[PDB]
Design a protein around this ligand. Structure first.
Ligand SMILES: O=P(O)(O)OC[C@H]1O[C@@H](O)[C@H](O)[C@@H](O)[C@@H]1O
Ligand SMILES: O=P(O)(O)OC[C@H]1O[C@@H](O)[C@H](O)[C@@H](O)[C@@H]1O
Ligand SMILES: O=P(O)(O)OC[C@H]1O[C@@H](O)[C@H](O)[C@@H](O)[C@@H]1O
Ligand SMILES: O=P(O)(O)OC[C@H]1O[C@@H](O)[C@H](O)[C@@H](O)[C@@H]1O
Lengths: 476, 476, 476, 476
């Protein structure tokens, strides 16, 4: 941490760069979390200056008047380099610009690819070919999409593998940076009270939920090509499945943890359409932005088939999980914002309360209002002896009010400086993900089934509820 | 419940009768919980009138101005009968007074013995000999002490057994009427989340705690004869042990439940002095009432040996519990009021967090501020990955604010009308209790060891803490 | 054991007395297992002599020439007393005959009732009224049938309860005296390897089997009144259910054990006809004694409905067993002699051998050729990797060859001298047994359904197999 | 399997080649287990002919007169090639000799390295450089030793990794080819009866035993350089530890299985000398070959320190195993031949048999007389109620008599043709093995402690027994 570090924002000119990456690296700098000797270098097609990037990005910093001195130090340690994405000369200028930086030939190089997936191969080759420290380490941060299926992801993933070792590749699933998501492991493996119950003997099912109350909101053109499954299920929701299901690792080292995650996936068969319900939101007449359907987006092809809601049931066919359905439910334009892990436990054996009991559930609400609670039965207070539902809760907000939770990107980026791959997608992890959904996704493309309509603002298709019931979920 | 009931307060003239029993039966009447056709009959040595009892007791009723009509109906359904406790004629007048009551020869008779233990034999014989309904049922409510040891309790208990069947005898441990105490069963057998963990594989120990911040406060003369163990441990604390430890019964019928309780006790060997630490409170110089010791009570014999604090460790030598110490800790003049069940779970197997973990605990606070919470580990919020202690809680007060909790005596008495023995001490239950402590208690009487002093307002003798540590409790 | 004991064979003149009881008490005497000072007194209607009883019974003794001295000592310690069963004078002579015996007024009195059930009340009253030692203890041995249903059994059982305390009543189920039957407890509670698996998580079902290859063989007249259920299922098979299912007791004391047995039963609902298949054997044309059906017995009413085969499924609705069917299968004139406990375990979770696995079973063969074995899977020996069925066995015969196993009656009678009720039916035990089958038995009497025919020498009705399959047994 | 295969015995001239490899490949050929179109090619320094190799090896074949036709076909499909081990020309002749073989350029090439470890690098390079099929697959079989410690093994292992992919490298631990050793997985994962008990809650320890009744018997010169640990413990015994301890894999694919094995090892800390007892055999005066010690070998350096017996205790620090000692006991010149896995289960909770119980054990005897049995408690047969030790056994010999068990090398070699790496040591597997023992082995070399003497024919040092006792083994 006494070494010089260079943080290279590739695609500096872009919106992600201006709205998220620059301010994220400001907040780590601001808070004194980065190495002392850190430089930021933007690179993009445009011919820009640090001055111009500051105008673009400084609105987004949430900067105060007492950070004026820090803000200027920060911009002092910024520079820019105009260049093209497959132009070997451009990378030459970039590499010697970096070398000209205080101890640049020594410095650890960190490349954030804030760019569309179409330039990834170009960029990763050029970086490898001409921008790599000879002394320092070189890490590369990459966002999704990682291919569109197993075949496309493999093409990309072999390219990069040919160029970089796994310990230089940091693929991002930003859910891996959320407070409650990271906390899953601690909940499970720090506590004895959650050990003996975490298996097929006690859990009737697991429900992994992703919901947003807004639709595609203008930009449904980008979405139409991807779909809800690819956008949210194959990545975020399955990451959570993995943390929920993984065996306990020997250590917290990055690859012991990821070995367990990938082991979970290897245990899961390809999804059969039989277990999938799809949905597409239509407008709501009885309601501004909610009045339009998915299709009333001008950016979305007429008569499109793309699903904005998917409910899918998976199985982890191993000793601990066999037969226990994992229900993955996701969609946009729904009744709420929520991201949630919910385990529904089995009924109690030998009931002595004449069926009045309700299944216990452990609930880890990821957002909003981060909390982890158990729904359980207690004797109805007062002059009664009938049990009733209640819950023991750890609601972050009451318990920890003062504390401010860092943003996923703040956490993750810091891990790249610190070298922790634990919270980043590995290549095997990545391909197991693709082989689980790939047959279904080709099917869909091939058979192009009409999603089930769902009115904007509802909980999604009734048929999704019907499915969950069929594999042994219980609504109460 | 359409039958006439007579509630006979034996010892009506006494303080318990005036401070607790009369007002308790008022509150059940007030709230419309008793049978419509209920009569209250006081019986005591004094020559009194309903008028006099009303003057004595009505202060204690918490009566309002809108209950004026109910208060008069209540006193209308009262009467008194002056009589002596071993005088056959007195019981004759009482029995025909009862007969003269609307359907008195039919009426179900309920006898509350609000009397010292010295008259129990006299009274129960006379009642049986001359006061028993021929048509209705006859139940008898009895409070402690039930003997002073196995031998004395057996003498009393054979007397009453000769006279009444078990289903006519309602022995009271008022702890059995507390909200959280009753709730133990529902916590355990309604929930799956507390099933798999409730055994020797997961629990390192159980701590059953009884504490009061006041001393004997003048009346240490009555206490000196009994001692903390007999006063609190042999009854209340062991009742809780039983509810904590009992196997799940087939049904909630009174005798299935009590079969399980008595089964637990049969599994417990006699306490050896080796596992007992005793204590006697001395005054605190640095503090009104706290300035005096136990011995500075004028009502307490000079140089007494009686213990006001006892810590004892027991074992339930069966499949589920073998080796798991149950720590019973009790005493007066301590740092707080608390009654509490605390299970301390074992460490987690295969720790991956470098010893930073702390043992989980499940805590059912009986009083004050009734609650049930789990102490567990959560990932330290914010930019950390180190677990820290936290808890999920169900605090009655936040969750159920509006609800008012009935008093133990309100609950129990109602059960006597309804005929539920589930919450009353059975004779076998009673004698198993005595055989567990009887050898120790005779020892004490015989060897009269000097209790360990403890300053008023402290947590009790350090040596108690030393003991708990020795059998595998962990302070953190 | 230095006291005088008198063993009173009531019904000495009868066949059971001559074929079993006399020789049984000879073998205990022969082997030096009885108290030194033991007398045998026969009592029956006939006017007999010790000489006559010796002629009747000595054939059955299996006596050798070196036991000549023991045989004469034995008959020396015999006497007889002619008397009637409800004649107060007869019991007077019997009681003073006993008194005239060396220390007879002191001697412990043991009454074996080798008599039909119709005289039980008469006999037990007279014994109590006039034959009871004032100094020694008095025990009474009683065989089935104990009533024909709950109501009749209660009448008998209240009679005897009025007269004798439970610790004087020794009701017999001779299955309780079989080597493998007694061994159940040791198998279960001595071994750790059979603890964790003994519950609803691992056992798919339990099959308790009773079979005989012979029919009623002439005496089907006595049987017609009783039926297979009453004859074998309500007693023997359910005793085995109890030993299989009971929780572990605290100690091996007689009443801790029996408390657990009766606890199991209390947990079982009344059998519904829905779970019962009945059978009656018809003759086999293709085969001496096997050529006749049940009905071709001259002693059996024409067109009788009595079942010689019953398959019934029961549930023990508690924490450990809930949902696990206990299949009780019994019948006469079947393919073999066998008495057997067979637990069929569930499939393994997360199968890695492509369905080639078979459910494990633990098997305790009670008779013939006493053994306890596990059927399990082993890698097919040789150049293979496919698992196949095999078994680990403890076959008594190979392992213990020299040892001769005492007869049930030898064991039990000795327990009556030693005072061990552990292996005898208690009154609560008895009535729980009756309430489980009583509704079904009245039904049958009322609706008189035609049993399903089954050819002599077969395994019984196909429909029985169909039932077992329906509640989750698997034939492989 | 319709392809041509070439089996290249490198070091054909050697004793292993003549005594084991040639006859092994004969027996697979003889039994029709190899591909139809198989050629055998010997290569060694000597200038030999097929004729000469046949003279050398045919004694060892166990050939009959009816295999005369098969024996000639076999030798017809043999050839030889004289060559040196680092001579590029020699490999050129070998590669074109192979090409000249019916479809040789197509044929799958199988290289058995029947050679000392000193030529491994030379040979594997030359093979890679010039002998590799362009069409067929090329596999290489390699025996131990694989380095002498982590550093030496890494040098070798990086060499070969540079040249060949893991799926071309077949490292041998011949224990992996033994019937009972392979059967471990089936025992564990095919059966439910061994699932719930296979963890730290039920197992007090595991004892992995290797013993031989003969010493080094002349060739103690080769041994002196290696030692018992390196010779037997680091490989065979730890392989068995792995099969005993591994989590259940998702599938039986080679790398799922090996992932679990290597996962076990990663969970094991480096052995501390504190847990090691070492031994060296001295002669026995009271006994031919047993009269000499290790040191009385002329081939062994005077005053050597090498251990012929090692007892070591290891821990697998994970959820399933934490705290359960794995006792590895091995040595030569001992009281017997035995290779054995023995699990000793914990005592039963809540003993009701007054300490008469003994710990249960599951025993898988690998050799001699292959068997798997459980030692357990049964009620002492006859007129007793005291439990005693007994066992349920599956003894191969009684149960499977006719069947002949193939030799480890027969099994393994066949797997190389079939392409199953499941039973071969992987590189990670290999290095985890080395890091566990490497610190201890350097210590020993450095501190050269004097092993504890042990008389030839005994069970080894008393101190080994003392150790086992200290970590919670119980001798009974
Ligand atoms: O819940 P978050 O943090 O806002 O992230 C959800 C978003 O994550 C992105 O990965 C998806 O592409 C978006 O479709 C989705 O809306
Ligand atoms: O906690 P509670 O409800 O006030 O009861 C505690 C009291 O209960 C009584 O049984 C004891 O005799 C008292 O000594 C004790 O103080
Ligand atoms: O199997 P055992 O020991 O011979 O006993 C079976 C007999 O036991 C008796 O109880 C039954 O009345 C008979 O019907 C039955 O045949
Ligand atoms: O038990 P097995 O099959 O004969 O193998 C034991 C031999 O295996 C070899 O690996 C060891 O080098 C020898 O020292 C050992 O004797």
């Amino acid at each position: 941490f006494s070494d010089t570090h260079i943080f290279i924002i590739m695609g500096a000119s872009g919106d992600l760069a201006k709205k998220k990456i620059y301010p994220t690296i400001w907040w780590l700098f601001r808070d004194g979390l980065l190495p002392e000797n850190t430089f930021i270098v933007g690179y993009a097609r445009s011919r820009l200056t640090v001055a111009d990037i500051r105008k673009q990005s400084e609105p987004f910093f949430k900067a105060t008047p007492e950070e004026k001195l820090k803000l200027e130090d920060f911009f002092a340690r910024n520079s820019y380099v105009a260049g093209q994405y497959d132009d070997a000369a451009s990378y030459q200028r970039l590499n010697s610009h970096m070398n000209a930086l205080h101890l640049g030939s020594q410095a650890n190089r960190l490349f954030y690819l804030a760019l569309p997936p179409t330039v990834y191969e170009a960029v990763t080759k050029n970086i490898h070919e001409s921008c790599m420290s000879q002394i320092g380490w070189n890490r590369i941060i990459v966002e999704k999409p990682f291919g569109r299926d197993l075949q496309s992801s493999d093409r990309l993933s072999n390219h990069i593998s040919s160029l970089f070792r796994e310990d230089q590749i940091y693929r991002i699933d930003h859910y891996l940076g959320k407070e409650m998501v990271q906390n899953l492991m601690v909940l499970r493996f720090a506590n004895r009270i959650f050990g003996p119950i975490w298996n097929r003997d006690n859990i009737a099912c697991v429900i992994l939920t992703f919901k947003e109350p807004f639709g595609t909101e203008g930009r449904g053109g980008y979405f139409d090509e991807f779909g809800i499954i690819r956008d949210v299920m194959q990545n975020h929701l399955l990451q959570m499945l993995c943390l929920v299901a993984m065996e306990k690792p020997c250590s917290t080292n990055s690859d012991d943890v990821r070995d367990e995650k990938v082991k979970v996936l290897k245990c899961i068969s390809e999804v059969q359409a039989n277990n999938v319900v799809l949905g597409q939101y239509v407008g709501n007449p009885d309601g501004g932005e909610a009045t339009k359907g998915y299709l009333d987006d001008p950016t979305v092809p007429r008569g499109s088939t793309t699903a904005t809601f998917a409910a899918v049931v998976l199985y982890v066919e191993n000793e601990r999980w066999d037969g226990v359905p994992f229900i993955l439910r996701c969609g946009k334009a729904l009744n709420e914002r929520k991201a949630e892990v919910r385990l529904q436990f089995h009924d109690v054996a030998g009931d002595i309360f004449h069926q009045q009991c309700k299944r216990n559930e452990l609930v880890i609400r990821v957002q909003p209002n981060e909390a982890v609670y158990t729904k359980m039965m207690t004797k109805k207070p007062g002059m009664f002896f009938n049990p009733e539902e209640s819950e023991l809760d750890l609601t972050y907000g009451n318990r920890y009010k003062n504390v401010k939770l860092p943003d996923a990107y703040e956490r993750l980026i810091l891990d790249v400086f610190c070298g922790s791959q634990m919270h980043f997608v590995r290549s095997d992890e990545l391909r197991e993900a693709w082989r689980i959904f790939t047959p279904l996704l080709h099917q869909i493309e091939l058979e192009k089934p009409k999603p089930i309509p769902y009115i904007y603002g509802s909980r999604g298709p009734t048929e999704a509820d019907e499915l969950m019931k069929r594999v042994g979920f219980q609504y109460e």
